[PDB]
Ligand binder design. Sequence first.
Ligand code: SF4
Lengths: 285, 287
Amino acid sequence: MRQCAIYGKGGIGKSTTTQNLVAALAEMGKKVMIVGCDPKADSTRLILHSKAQNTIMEMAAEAGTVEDLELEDVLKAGYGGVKCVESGGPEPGVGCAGRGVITAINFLEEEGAYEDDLDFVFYDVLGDVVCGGFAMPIRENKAQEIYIVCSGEMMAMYAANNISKGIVKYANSGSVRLGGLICNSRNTDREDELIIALANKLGTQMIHFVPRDNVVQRAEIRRMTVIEYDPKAKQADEYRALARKVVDNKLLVIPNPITMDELEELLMEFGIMEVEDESIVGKTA
Amino acid sequence: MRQCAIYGKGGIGKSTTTQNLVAALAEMGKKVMIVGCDPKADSTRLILHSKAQNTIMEMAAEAGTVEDLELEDVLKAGYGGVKCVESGGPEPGVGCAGRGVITAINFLEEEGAYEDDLDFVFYDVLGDVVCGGFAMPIRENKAQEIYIVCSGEMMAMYAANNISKGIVKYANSGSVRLGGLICNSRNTDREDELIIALANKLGTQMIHFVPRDNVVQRAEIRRMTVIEYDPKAKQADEYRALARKVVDNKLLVIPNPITMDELEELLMEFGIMEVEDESIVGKTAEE
Ligand code: SF4
């Protein structure tokens, strides 16, 4: 069983890419489980055709304690037999993402959910502020092959750099490694070139460039993946290509994070960021 | 001294509005301090015309402990005499954002940064995932008046609701209260009506609607607020109006958070989100 995680910031389609990748793996005959660890996204909605899946945190509070929770109420099967679980985001004002994911993983391990025919587990993790809590899957050596979803924009690339810093922090134990960057296109010129250049500086690869295509939203509105909604679409073949490359990937590395100066240099080289006129700084009109 | 915090999610102009509001208060004769508590934004760059202000976390790490730091190296003055500090985000992979923010605030107190002549302190806090960490300024009673920057978009309004739930969590034990919503316009139709409706459901008010105007960008490129770059511009009057309403505000409430169904209902009612056709859910193209 390969223990994987998809990390990335919010608002760039990370969870839609994760679920479409997972659907492509199931189509290939792989047994997969998704464990949602992103308080800002529905990590399983497209596999289950659901509005919202009951979370481990919510159900544990409904049954009093996680000790009296039944696996059947938290683990659901959807398209292609993919098994789906949601951890539950932190209780507002009180919770910590690190505590929630420890609780979910310990529960699934005690109930034998990882023992199956399982070929892959994917943790879908919010990777923006890479604090100790959201890095808990790394610290606990559960997210062993990490793929970072990003886009050719400053905040998404900054997040990729901070996720890489988190991987570096734990390099002296366990075996957590970076497997590559996935570029979720935003229809920006030279975006593919930019993420390839970032991957090169980080010491990894851009494993796939995911195009923007209206069929993604046509499937999302029906609460499904493209693989299920229209397996003949061009975009379905894009997710199949990504899935094949993930299955076959042996290029797992400890990355080399960059400085903010180096990041700004990349954004300028590829036309995203304009040069700063230091001569007008502080000058009124 | 009034202890305020601005909470809201990233990517919607929160720190730009905070600094322009603070600059308007300084122009009004108020002595203000900004304490930056957002890992993802720069809360002081437009007050200092700076590319980046050295943070307490980074300087403490170089010096060894926060006990080795001098206030003169972390607290800098900029436009209108506004004093600026940056807490610094968590060390990636290990740190907690809240523990760093509380370490920073305690250092400022012990070194007398809250001078008896200060009119306002504003904490600029990331309010998206409102975990225990980013609620630590609320739990530790460091900010009494919370203002939420939002916009007429699902994720920003979800963040506003989460911030409100964090406030409720500590209301029976402390004095923290919600003072209002500030709408950062995104040129979306009926956006002001949407935030007026949300504020009413939560029990608060829309304290101001901040329009979008190219003059904000023209000042930003020079690392400046609009108040300093062009105090005659119309947008400069919006920040002054916002500053006046904050000074005069007396509505400080325990909010009433809404459910996600009620939030989607608001978004569908005001044209942001379409009605969902249940009949096509789960139906393949072949069907
Ligand atoms: S470690 Fe991160 S998720 Fe946990 S309370 Fe601190 S900031 Fe929040």
